[PDB]
């Protein structure tokens, strides 16, 4: 049951090696922008990232030790959260801008409807990470935490739940390990640890709003939604 046997450093390297690639959008600066077309670009990108996320999830320590049914549930709860934290991570060095893709960098003058509040919230999260000087090693920890945590309290023989918590504790250990390694005092480590986990509440909040808008987009039947996206969306309803 490997995951519990990994040292903190082996945990990190494992997570770092499992990192999905940064995909490109199909954005054309030739083609005139519209709310519909731009949204289609984002949902197309999201759909393609989903395929990588699913195969990245299988390389997260402890995840493969779960039932197939539990794996499905965890991803259905966490996928947009994971897309969102991925977005704000690669947007860090672009103050005021959201790097959806290397060829799709948005300042949130985009415009499109109902999405203003989030670019702002995603930008706030991104800038927040920048001020904390979040490390890639800390990032991959956070992401793995979201995968295992977001669906744990909606999932009876229960020791799958215990195993997940055992893995979560192990990742907590890995986060502290990193912060101590960075020269932080004990007080500083706890504080940074807390600060990072509290941001996950806002990411949860952003994701919740995310599913809401996605529902409306579906019912308005203008922006094309892939079959996988529609199925994930049905999971949340």
């Amino acid at each position: 049951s490997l995951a519990l046997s990994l040292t903190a450093d082996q945990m990190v390297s494992a997570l770092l090696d499992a990192e999905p690639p940064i995909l490109y959008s199909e954005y054309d600066p030739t083609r005139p922008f519209s709310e519909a077309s731009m949204m289609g670009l984002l949902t197309n990108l999201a759909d393609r990232e989903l395929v990588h996320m699913i195969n990245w999830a299988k390389r997260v320590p402890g995840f493969v030790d779960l039932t197939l049914h539990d794996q499905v549930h965890l991803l259905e709860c966490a996928w947009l959260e994971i897309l969102m934290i991925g977005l704000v991570w690669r947007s860090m060095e672009h103050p005021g801008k959201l790097l959806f893709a290397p060829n799709l960098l948005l300042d949130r003058n985009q415009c499109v409807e109902g999405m203003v509040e989030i670019f702002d919230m995603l930008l706030a999260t991104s800038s927040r990470f920048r001020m904390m000087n979040l490390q890639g090693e800390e990032f991959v920890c956070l992401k793995s935490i979201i995968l295992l945590n977001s669906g744990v309290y909606t999932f009876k023989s229960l020791e799958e739940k215990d195993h997940i918590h055992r893995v979560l504790d192990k990742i907590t250990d890995t986060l502290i390990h990193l912060m101590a390694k960075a020269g932080l005092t004990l007080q500083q480590q706890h504080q940074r640890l807390a600060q990072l986990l509290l941001i996950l509440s806002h990411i949860r909040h952003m994701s919740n709003k995310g599913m809401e808008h996605l529902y409306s987009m579906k019912c308005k039947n203008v922006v094309p939604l892939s079959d996988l996206l529609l199925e994930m969306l049905d999971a949340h309803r």
Binding site: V51, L68, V72, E76, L228, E231
Partner: peptide, 10 residues
């Protein structure tokens, strides 16, 4: 049955 299921199953 679900796409997510099949991909995960693969």
């Amino acid at each position: 049955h679900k796409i997510l299921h099949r991909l995960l199953q693969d």
